[PDB]
């Protein structure tokens, strides 16, 4: 009987060993994730491998380009609610990762904001100022002009992104959902995604 | 029809190869796999492929679970046989009597 | 000695039980998913709630 009891206890001790193994392994997975977040430096927006291939093609071509999130930063007076609205609309439209190009480029597997004149009504340039990165190949005057390109009123069946988050894409008109505080737009925001 | 299949200058159009012009913007779409959303055939293909995946997963998991049942049954038989072993264990009856 | 061996066997029985739980979690989800795809109204593109 005593050995029956101790056998049971030994089995459960083994179960304790197994769960110690399990928790060590869970802590190792958590540790690996923690290591990944600790050695992060700058997370970028959503992309497809085709867009990366195309942008490699652009680099091989030497075309002047810089992604939008890497191109602009919000102004001081633009509090977190406004940042959220503008970044959510850009992300929903995909404009967030869209490319600003010095020349009228046509993208393959990618999107380019050609500086075609969209100088009618209010624009996002009112709220945003350019923020050029270390790899910038484009001047801020053109970027500012593109910021003016993004309109805040319907161009019929055309392109615009309002401050309240609505956007028109071709025949489409849209409004963005909640996405939380800004993480991609601005130097502070890109690092912030990493910290939580 | 509000969507053209030939370049409309700076205007709005979406070509067959996936390129599109939407104002000052020009874009081209990435890989998204075979059509899944547009049309009954595409939606049904999505449904059938998802169904096939889940059916194969249920089959594999059932096979593994029946294998697990076999292992557990063998382990129970082993414990039983251990108890049976206890009975077969030698006894010192003759030596103690002597 | 028999009890040393039997503790190991109990452990392996326990591992089978743990993997039975595991099969329960993957296979129950697969059954639910298969029913859902049978009851698929439509495919949903990228969306927010």
Kindly write down the DSSP assignment for every residue of B36-95, as one continuous string.
Answer: -SSSHHHHHHHHHHHHHHHHHHHHHHHHHHHHHHHHHHHHHHHHHHHHHHHHHS---HHH
Cβ of B22 within 8 Å of Cβ of A160? The answer is no
Helix (H, G, I), strand (E, B) or coil at A128: strand
Compute the distance between CA of residue B32 and CA of residue A36 in angstroms, rounded to an integer: 28
Q: A112 contacts in B (CB within 8 Å)?
A: 25-27
- Give dist(CA B64, CA A181) in Å, integer: 46
CA distance readout (Å), B77 to A9, B68, B81, B83, B84: 21, 14, 6, 10, 10
Q: What does the block give as tokens for B53?
A: 């995946």
Nearest CA-CA distance, residue B79 and chain C, Å: 7
The two beta strands, A111-113 and A99-101, are parallel
From chain B, the residues in CB contact with C31 under 8 A are 54, 58
**Would an 8 Å CB–CB cutoff place A191 in contact with chain B?**
no
Q: How far apart are CA A51 and CA C40, in angstroms?
A: 32
Q: What is the DSSP letter of A96?
A: G
Q: Under an 8 A CB cutoff, do B79 and C12 touch?
A: no
CA A96 to CA A69: how far, in whole Å?
Answer: 6
CB pair distance less than 8 Å for B23 and A111: no
In chain B, what's the furthest Cα-to-Cα distance?
114
Per the listing, tokens 């990435």 go with B30
List all residues 6 or more positions away from A104 whose beta carbon is below 8 Å from its beta carbon: A114, A115, A116
Angle at A161 between CA A160 and CA A166, to 5 degrees: 115
Spatial CB neighbours of A98, under 8 Å, sequence gap ≥ 6: A67, A68, A111, A112, A113, B25, B27
CA–CA gap between residue A186 and residue A82 (Å, rounded)? 13
- Name the token pair of C19: 């993997």
Sign of CA dihedral A177, A182, A185, A191: negative
Which residues are CB-contacts of A108 (< 8 A; sequence separation ≥ 6)?
A54, A57, B19, B28
The closest CB to that of C11, out of A6, A14, A177, belongs to A14
Cα–Cα–Cα angle for A175, A97, B8, rounded to 5 degrees = 75
| Rounded (5°) CA angle A96-A100-A105 | 125
Say if residues A122 and A136 touch (Cβ distance below 8 Å). Answer: no
Q: Residue A73 corresponds to which tokens in the numbers above?
A: 């930063």
The shortest C-alpha distance from C21 to chain A (Å) reads: 14
A78-106: burial string, b at 16+ Cβ within 10 Å, e else: beeebbbbbbbbbbbbbbbbbbbbeeebe
Method: cryo-EM
3-state secondary structure of A166: strand
Q: How far apart are CA B77 and CA B88, in angstroms?
A: 16
Spatial CA neighbour of B59 closest among A179, A12, C31: C31
Answer yes or no: are the C-beta atoms of C28 and B84 closer than 8 Å.
no
The answer to whether A114 touches B26, Cβ cutoff 8 Å, is yes
């Amino acid at each position: 009987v005593v050995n029956d009891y101790i056998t049971d206890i030994s089995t459960k001790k083994k179960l304790m060993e197994t769960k110690i193994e399990d928790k060590k392994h869970e802590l190792e997975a958590a540790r690996a994730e923690l290591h990944h977040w600790k050695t992060l430096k700058m997370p970028n927006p959503d992309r497809a491998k085709d867009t990366e291939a195309f942008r490699l093609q652009l680099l091989e071509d030497g075309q002047a380009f810089i992604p939008f999130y890497a191109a602009v930063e919000f102004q001081d007076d633009v509090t977190e609610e406004q940042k959220e609205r503008i970044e959510s609309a850009l992300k929903q439209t995909g404009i967030l990762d869209s490319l600003i190009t010095e020349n009228a480029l046509a993208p393959t597997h990618d999107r380019v904001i050609r500086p075609e004149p969209q100088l009618l009504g209010y624009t996002l340039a009112d709220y945003l100022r350019p923020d050029l990165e270390a790899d910038s190949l484009i001047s801020n005057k053109l970027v500012d002009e593109i910021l003016r390109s993004i309109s805040l009123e319907q161009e019929g069946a055309g392109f615009h992104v309002d401050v309240d988050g609505s956007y028109s894409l071709g025949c489409l008109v849209g409004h963005a959902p909640n996405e939380g505080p800004s993480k991609y737009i601005g130097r502070s925001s890109r690092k912030r995604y990493q910290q939580e | 029809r509000s969507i053209s299949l030939e370049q409309e200058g700076a205007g709005f159009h979406v070509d067959v190869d996936g390129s599109y012009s939407l104002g000052c913007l020009v874009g081209h779409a990435p890989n998204e796999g075979p059509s899944k959303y547009i049309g009954r055939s595409s939606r049904k293909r999505y449904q059938q492929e998802k169904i096939k995946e889940c059916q194969e997963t249920i089959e594999q998991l059932q096979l593994e679970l029946e294998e697990l049942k076999v292992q557990l049954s063998q382990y129970e038989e082993n414990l039983l046989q251990a108890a049976q072993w206890k009975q077969t264990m030698p006894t010192d009856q003759e030596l103690n009597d002597l």
